[PDB]
């Protein structure tokens, strides 16, 4: 109800650099209304952290810059396909409290096998393109 | 949509 913005993350060489990703990789810091607002970031685990999500790709949104007070915001994660359309969208039904270095997301965001399927067309040119949509309320 | 979690748990 205060500020709604988005960020697109393109991860090049998803399968080619799967060994070079490691446990977790984080995107560049992003923020809209830069002079007014605060820095965000996107974290993704190519392989899940635990046995429950070992066959899934986990995606999280984390607050980087120290805010003046508690931050509450909703988020919506989706995967852009070959034609640039949103697919497998997953959004938090309610908002969640954010502090510096705190993250929120989905452990089972997408099945890792469904992602690698050539039929789904999710990885063109070996590139996973993610789309985040934050709605900060204050 | 889907269950939400954190990576601090």
Structural commentary:
- The complex is a heterodimer of chains A (138) and B (9).
- Chain A is mainly beta and 138 residues long.
- Chain A has one domain.
- Chain A contains two helices and nine strands.
- In chain A, strands 1, 5, 6, 7 and 9 form a five-stranded antiparallel sheet that branches. Chain A has a four-stranded antiparallel sheet with strand order 2-3-4-8.
- In chain A, a hairpin with a 5-residue loop joins strand 5 (71-80) and strand 6.
- Chain A starts with a strand and ends with a strand.
- Chain B contains no helices and no strands.
- The termini of chain B are far apart.
- Chain B is largely without helices or strands and 9 residues long.
Structural class of chain A: mainly beta
Number of strands of chain A: 9
Structural class of chain B: little secondary structure
Shape of chain A: globular
The major sheet of chain B is characterized as: none
Main sheet makeup of chain A: 5 strands, antiparallel
Distance between the termini of chain B: 20 Å
Protein name (chain A): Speckle-type POZ protein
Subcellular location (chain A): Nucleus; Nucleus speckle; Cytoplasm
Region (Important for binding substrate proteins) (chain A): 96-106
Domain MATH (chain A): 4-134
Q: Which terms summarize this structure?
A:
heterodimer; A: 138 residues; mainly beta; five-stranded antiparallel beta sheet; four-stranded antiparallel beta sheet; 9 strands; B: 9 residues; little secondary structure; protein binding; MATH domain; E3 ubiquitin ligase; DNA damage response
Brief characterization of the structure:
Chain A is built from 2 helices and 9 strands. By secondary structure, chain A is mainly beta. Chain B has 9 residues and is largely without helices or strands.
């Amino acid at each position: 109800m205060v500020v709604k913005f988005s960020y697109m993350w393109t991860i090049n060489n998803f399968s080619f650099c799967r060994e070079e990703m490691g446990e977790v990789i984080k995107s560049s810091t992003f923020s809209s209304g830069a002079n007014d607002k605060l820095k965000w970031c996107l974290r993704v685990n190519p392989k899940g952290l635990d046995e429950e999500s070992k066959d899934y790709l986990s995606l999280y949104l984390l607050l980087v810059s120290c805010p003046k007070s508690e931050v509450r915001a909703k988020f919506k994660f989706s995967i852009l396909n070959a034609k640039g359309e949103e697919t497998k969208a997953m959004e938090s039904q309610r908002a969640y409290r954010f502090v510096q270095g705190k993250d929120w997301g989905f452990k089972k965001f997408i099945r890792r096998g469904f992602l690698l399927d050539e039929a789904n067309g999710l990885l063109p040119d070996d590139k996973l393109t993610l789309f985040c949509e934050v709605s900060v309320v204050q | 949509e889907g269950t939400v979690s954190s990576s601090t748990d």
